[PDB]
Design a protein around this motif. Structure first.
Motif, mmCIF file in Angstrom:
data_model
loop_
_atom_site.group_PDB
_atom_site.id
_atom_site.type_symbol
_atom_site.label_atom_id
_atom_site.label_comp_id
_atom_site.label_asym_id
_atom_site.label_seq_id
_atom_site.Cartn_x
_atom_site.Cartn_y
_atom_site.Cartn_z
ATOM 1 N N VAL A 139 0.840 -1.186 0.000
ATOM 2 C CA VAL A 139 0.000 0.000 0.000
ATOM 3 C C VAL A 139 0.878 1.240 0.000
ATOM 4 N N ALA A 140 1.844 1.248 0.907
ATOM 5 C CA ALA A 140 2.776 2.359 1.033
ATOM 6 C C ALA A 140 3.443 2.680 -0.307
ATOM 7 N N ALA A 141 3.788 1.637 -1.052
ATOM 8 C CA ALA A 141 4.436 1.812 -2.345
ATOM 9 C C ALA A 141 3.468 2.311 -3.420
ATOM 10 N N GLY A 142 2.217 2.549 -3.036
ATOM 11 C CA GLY A 142 1.259 3.043 -4.007
ATOM 12 C C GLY A 142 0.216 2.068 -4.504
ATOM 13 N N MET A 143 0.484 0.776 -4.398
ATOM 14 C CA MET A 143 -0.483 -0.204 -4.857
ATOM 15 C C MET A 143 -1.867 0.084 -4.273
ATOM 16 N N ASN A 144 -2.905 -0.146 -5.066
ATOM 17 C CA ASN A 144 -4.264 0.102 -4.603
ATOM 18 C C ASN A 144 -4.685 -0.963 -3.597
ATOM 19 N N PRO A 145 -5.079 -0.544 -2.395
ATOM 20 C CA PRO A 145 -5.496 -1.495 -1.366
ATOM 21 C C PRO A 145 -6.672 -2.379 -1.778
ATOM 22 N N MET A 146 -7.710 -1.789 -2.368
ATOM 23 C CA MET A 146 -8.870 -2.575 -2.784
ATOM 24 C C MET A 146 -8.451 -3.722 -3.697
ATOM 25 N N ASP A 147 -7.537 -3.455 -4.627
ATOM 26 C CA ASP A 147 -7.070 -4.510 -5.521
ATOM 27 C C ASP A 147 -6.303 -5.577 -4.728
ATOM 28 N N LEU A 148 -5.332 -5.151 -3.924
ATOM 29 C CA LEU A 148 -4.562 -6.090 -3.126
ATOM 30 C C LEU A 148 -5.550 -6.956 -2.359
ATOM 31 N N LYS A 149 -6.562 -6.324 -1.785
ATOM 32 C CA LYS A 149 -7.550 -7.055 -1.025
ATOM 33 C C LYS A 149 -8.216 -8.100 -1.910
ATOM 34 N N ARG A 150 -8.329 -7.806 -3.201
ATOM 35 C CA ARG A 150 -8.958 -8.732 -4.141
ATOM 36 C C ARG A 150 -8.018 -9.888 -4.428
ATOM 37 N N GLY A 151 -6.817 -9.560 -4.882
ATOM 38 C CA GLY A 151 -5.836 -10.586 -5.171
ATOM 39 C C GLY A 151 -5.583 -11.455 -3.952
ATOM 40 N N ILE A 152 -5.847 -10.911 -2.770
ATOM 41 C CA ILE A 152 -5.650 -11.660 -1.542
ATOM 42 C C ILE A 152 -6.817 -12.607 -1.367
ATOM 43 N N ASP A 153 -8.020 -12.129 -1.659
ATOM 44 C CA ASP A 153 -9.214 -12.957 -1.509
ATOM 45 C C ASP A 153 -9.245 -14.134 -2.487
ATOM 46 N N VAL A 154 -8.859 -13.870 -3.729
ATOM 47 C CA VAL A 154 -8.834 -14.899 -4.751
ATOM 48 C C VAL A 154 -7.870 -15.996 -4.305
ATOM 49 N N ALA A 155 -6.585 -15.672 -4.304
ATOM 50 C CA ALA A 155 -5.541 -16.611 -3.919
ATOM 51 C C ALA A 155 -5.918 -17.450 -2.704
ATOM 52 N N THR A 156 -6.608 -16.837 -1.755
ATOM 53 C CA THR A 156 -7.003 -17.555 -0.558
ATOM 54 C C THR A 156 -8.019 -18.639 -0.876
#
Lengths: 482, 482, 482, 482
Positions: D106-123
């Protein structure tokens, strides 16, 4: 408990601080061009006043020592209000001047005891030169002129008082009171007035002054005391003391029961008790207006006392009986103030009560030029005066200068250079020549209408020099520790 | 207890601080382009207001001295609300200007007493030049035009008030009240209105103003007092004083019982007590609407008084009786406001009550141009005026400039350069020429509809100069120690 | 007590601080890609929310001034929740934008009153251009499409509401309620719904919203009040006021007793009292479902009113009677939500109640594109608009830009550059072209299913500009001292 | 009251602080080589523990914000203890890893909502790849092998549980209890077990867990509630709610009275009340062992329900009746633990209760390699997986690495370099190849005896990613001011 003891100068410089605050706050309100003093009221808007007496009461410094200096001066100068007048403010303005110079001298090495002496002498010389220069007030044309001036020009009150006075003697017992309609009258009820006050201040119904007003109270009296209290009309007890009205019985010795009797008839002492329409009580004086007794019972006592003194060969009790008889064969005049509304009667009652106090004091020792000139004039007497030594001489000069204080002040407040107003009055020739700050012209203070009861211009000066001496001869102070 | 005494300038600079805060917070809310003042409410959201009177009340500075300056000005200027109008805010904006300049001068050495004089003179000259320029309001065409304007254009209320006035005289006793349906009427019940208020503020049912509203109360009255209290309809006691409604009996002297009687019939004084549908009580005025007495018993008194005055040769009590008779042979008009819902009647009742107060004051001393121009115009009179000295002259110029304060402010708040708006009105020729901040055009303030009861533009100016003089002549302040 | 008075900018910079905190905390939760806001719970784990309304309530800054800024905005924007919708969050996001720019301008010298004007004008022009662009919702195919969308796609609830509406008119009186088993039905009991709420909030059984739910209460009513209180089924009192359910009687004037009667029959007013299965009470609206009266007694009143209006020539009370009759000849639909377990029925009841509120508001003024595009589109109208001066013009441009706030935000939260999303929608041609943050594609917001009741996109904008004007024209703040 | 609102990173860095403390204190106690955690006991000597669940409860940071981070993670990971297992500690160790990396991104700029998505999928992909790799447990030879391992090798308890299970089905209702002498038996009394818990935690006799144990209580029940309470054997009330045992009645709708009846017979509902030897109550589950009813009355209901469902054509309530019948035609097994002394029975009861919980969960979704290898293995599935964008891809890689957390830890605690243990298991080929920290050798985790109910290795991972997503998408925090 723990105490802080201040010695020498360290204790004096602090007293001087407390006095200067007290004198500087009060003296701004002096003369016809006085400035106001705003006083913080714990509730609402602040109190704006010019009355130097209300200011003096509000002064209470925090520093124990500084406060002692103020508390003292403020106490004595307050006794100068025994005749109720500008004495308090003058006593103060005077004390501040003498003390200021005294300590200055003391510091230079002069002996305080001597200064205190030279101060006492010079003062007596002036307290005298004043009396021996006061025009008397006996005639009803005068007592009515001093009664009017003391009322800012109310020729109506000047005569009103003159009347009451010309009905019970220049030294009688008057009691101004409010009425109903717009009708002013001077009745002469049958009442008395002892020379004692109350026992406790909390017993006072203070409305304006420490005076207890009791309408139709219960006048009782015995030769005992108020030890055990176990045993729609107010009450008033008169006895030895207490171990509603409470006052000590009048008279002493064999005159004890006699006094209680003389008044006993005046009130008629429930069926065997005395009554009175009104009874006022003060600090050291109580008045009983409109008793209840019957002229007959009253004419008997006066008759007994007469025949009594008629036999007394005693050159002493001759007055002790002739005086107690006047308390019966004299009466109690009572000006009845009346107007349109309570906003009037209650207003004029203050003007009359205020002007009737200046006159009653004007007739005692006469009247003398006002504006603080009497003091500067009398100071002329100290021209050649001398004491036993340089120190004693210093004390005399201190007073020679302190007397110019209340005048230069009154002048400064008006915008005039007090140093000049003083120099003119000094080089004066006519013992009645001064400066009138009201109009700002020099002349005959008397023709001007600027007068002061000589009894207040005298008491102020005595009281001031009274403390100025104590302070100047104080070596150590003891105050409690915080 | 301990006191902090501030002297000279040190005490003045602080007062000036408390006044400037008070004047700067209130003056932002002046004119048609006033700005809001947010007030922190101890619960919920803050109160947003433009009413300079609600702001003045909220001001209470922490520093004892600064607060005294504010508390004073704020108190006097509040009396200017005796006629309820923009006087409070103007009295304040004015005081601030005079004081600001006065102390400035004092500082430069000018004598305060003189400035206070030149200030008093110049003020009287203007307080006069104003009256001698106010268009009167007697006709019902006028009383209805001033009634409408005071209602922002409600021609309906302008006539409503004119009616009530043309039924009980321009100086009668009106009482606007809420009704039921959408019906407005001006009835004329039989009631009275003394000139006294209540005894304690805690006795008030303050809903908006300090006024006690009592519906169908118990009207009792005796010639005694309320000493001992031991001995579904509200009560109202009218006596001398107290040692539910509590008010002092009306009249004085021989008019005491008479007054109590005149009203006794009006109420009909439980079987031997007086009654009344409604009774309102204020600070120094109490109204009794719809009594209970019968026209007969009422027609008798009016008949007695008539025949009474018909015999009275007294050129004095001729009015004291002819006036008390009008309180009976006059009645009490009462506008009955009505609308659709309580959100209407309760709304219009405020507009009518607010406009009926501006008119009732407009008819007393006439009306004069509003917008703060009356003051600037009257100031023209001080053109050649002069006092006994330069100092006295200064006091006069201070007022010559202070009068431009409420106008320049009103102009600045609108965005216009008050220095210009003032210069134009100064060089003006038509005594009715000013500047209308509402539209931003110059002209005939009267034709514009910008008017102000001359009674408020006059009271504000007197009250301001009243304190500006006290402050300017204050030399010392005494506040309690923290 | 002591007060801290902040003036000019010093008072504005602080308000702006409290507003920015409030707007920055709430705006993170806007749109389909909202971020969460963790809220510290005094007990247990913190509350994680995205509902911008629950955040706004939690905001209470410590600094008296900063808090006033927040408390205000937060209060007004809360009234935008009168129609319960994303208005609160939008009113806030909007207010923050306008205020931010306004003060910026004010600082540059622009006149606040003018800016406030140009702001008011521009706003009206848009509040209009919006309505004149909202597709209506009357048909049951529409009322069922807006009912579904408002339920995230629950086509079941879209029809459920459409039914109830098509049974009591698009503007009837629906009351969603929980049932027992998995059975949903739309009954139409006989009840009423006044236009008044409760007397005290403490009288509310707040479970989710300030609404008092009373099952089988005691419906009583008199033409008096609740002065003296001295004189297994809940109670409900309906009178003038109070000096368990407590509500003020319905109607006014001659419609007072009538209204009380119309409902009297509905409830059947213990043997002589009215009854009702359920009675809900709100702030300014109370509903009585399933009364107790009998169709006969109910058919009589409706018959009387009919014949009553049948004679009334009054063109005014024609509606005042025809409207009160519908409260009887109308009924009260009531969706009965049912599921498997309480974890279902209580869940769907919230979705239905939430979607039935968006529709009921959608049918009043229509629906318009959602996603914060309606605002940006309507802003097109301000293209050539102009005010009386540069300052007034500025106020107009401020609004021209503030309207892009809720959209760019919604875009930023999603990861898209709001400056771009705005520029595209600006250069748009199709009044229904926007950006859908849910899928991230541009197009016809309507076909997309992104709509908003025009009543909320309008109330939000008015309320925002309502305070933005107050704040911008605030010159002084008064807060209590710590 | 006053609130402190933290935004953006400032609010995230603090949450991360509270999470790291919580995860660093708990994770030291992981695996066969766990280290102890000393816990200060307010009285006596400190508590030395290795149980990562007792540590998590003791964590309460002082800083409002840091605490919120911990309180959240700690709450969710605690629900992973719904199946009582090492899930809590794993959920925590996992959450800490994901969050740590997420915010970094997030700090590096990545969009949190997306990360949250890629996290949900992979899980989801892993939560699946796990199930599709878990050996089932149905046979009594298996259920007895998983029962023994879960008891550290107590082959006696492995069979004891297998028995009870083979008497009431793999998914029955067992209740391990203490006995008297050294005799262990598996009786099958006639009791029930609703799906509801208690109403208040203070109603719990918490001895070890929040479970209320009531021996021979009073089972009562009505279709009303516990509004007014006015109207040597414990009591148990079962109703709607309360306005000693207190639990809500079982069932819903038409199954309300039915459920109350089915149990009514089981207890026999003082002469007309139900009884039961023992009744346990939990959070959302209550068990009634050894009722009081008679087999006859019990055989009747079961007979009615049978014939009832025998007629029901409903494909829905077919289970709603067939399920409630099993609560009667099923019974309640109950392992009776016995030993030599209370220091034995009370000891083995904990081992059996602890092992019978691991099995009951092992049979639900099978068993899979323990030692935190299941996670690393399943992570193999994310090899080619891809999201809609780089950001979404990042979220996937975060999970790809977080899954190696519980293993490397378990390895580090043992002294082995987790980076190596991970690399070997990664390059592995046999889906059952890992590292056994107990002996420190690689191989077939299954043959090793290192297994974990797939239900806990799955719940832990879902719960972790559940919060890791919330935290990562939190933009603002609101905590109370000190």
């Amino acid at each position: 408990a723990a105490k802080e003891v201040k010695f020498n100068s360290d204790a004096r410089d602090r007293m001087l601080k407390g006095v200067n605050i007290l004198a500087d706050a009060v003296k701004v309100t002096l003369g016809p061009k006085g400035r106001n003093v705003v006083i913080d009221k714990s509730f609402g808007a602040p109190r704006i006043t010019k009355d130097g007496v209300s200011v003096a009461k509000e002064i209470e410094l925090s520093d124990k020592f500084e406060n002692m200096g103020a508390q003292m001066v403020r106490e004595v100068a307050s006794r100068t209000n025994d005749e109720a007048g500008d004495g308090t403010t003058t006593a103060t303005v005077l004390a501040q001047a003498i003390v200021r110079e005294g300590l200055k001298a003391v510091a230079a090495g002069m002996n305080p005891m001597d200064l205190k002496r030279g101060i006492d002498v010079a003062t007596a010389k002036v307290v005298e030169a004043i009396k021996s220069a006061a025009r008397p007030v006996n005639d009803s044309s005068e007592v009515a002129q001093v009664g009017t001036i003391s009322a800012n020009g109310e020729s109506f009150i000047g005569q009103q008082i003159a009347e009451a006075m010309q009905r019970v003697g220049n030294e009688g017992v008057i009691t101004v009171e409010e009425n109903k309609g717009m009708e002013t009258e001077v009745e002469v009820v049958e009442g008395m007035q002892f020379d004692r006050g109350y026992l406790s201040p909390y017993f006072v119904t203070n409305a304006d002054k420490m005076i207890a007003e009791l309408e139709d109270a219960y006048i009782l009296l015995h030769e005992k005391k108020l030890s055990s209290l176990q045993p729609q009309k107010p009450l008033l007890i008169v006895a030895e003391d207490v171990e509603i009205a409470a006052v000590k019985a009048p008279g002493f010795g064999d005159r004890r029961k006699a006094m209680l009797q003389d008044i006993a008839i005046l009130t008629g002492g429930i069926d065997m008790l005395g009554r009175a329409k009104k009874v006022s009580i003060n600090k050291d004086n109580t008045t009983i207006v409109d008793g209840a007794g019957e002229k007959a019972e009253i004419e008997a006592r006066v008759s007994q006392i007469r025949q009594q003194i008629e036999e007394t060969t005693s050159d002493y009790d001759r007055e002790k009986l002739q005086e107690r008889v006047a308390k019966l064969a004299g009466g109690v005049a009572v000006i009845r103030v009346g107007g349109m509304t309570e906003i009037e009667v209650k207003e004029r009652k203050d003007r009359v009560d205020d002007a009737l106090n200046a006159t009653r004091a004007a007739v005692q020792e006469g009247i003398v030029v006002g504006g603080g000139v009497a003091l500067v004039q009398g100071a002329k007497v100290l021209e050649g005066l001398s004491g036993a030594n340089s120190d004693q001489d210093a004390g005399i000069a201190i007073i020679r200068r302190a007397l110019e204080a209340p005048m230069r002040q009154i002048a400064e407040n008006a915008g005039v250079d007090g140093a000049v107003v003083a120099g003119k009055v000094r080089e004066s020739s006519d013992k009645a020549f001064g400066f009138n700050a009201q109009t700002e012209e020099y002349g005959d203070m008397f023709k001007f209408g600027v007068i002061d009861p000589a009894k207040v211009v005298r008491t102020a000066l005595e009281d001031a020099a009274s403390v100025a001496g104590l302070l100047i001869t104080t070596e150590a102070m003891i105050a409690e520790k915080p």
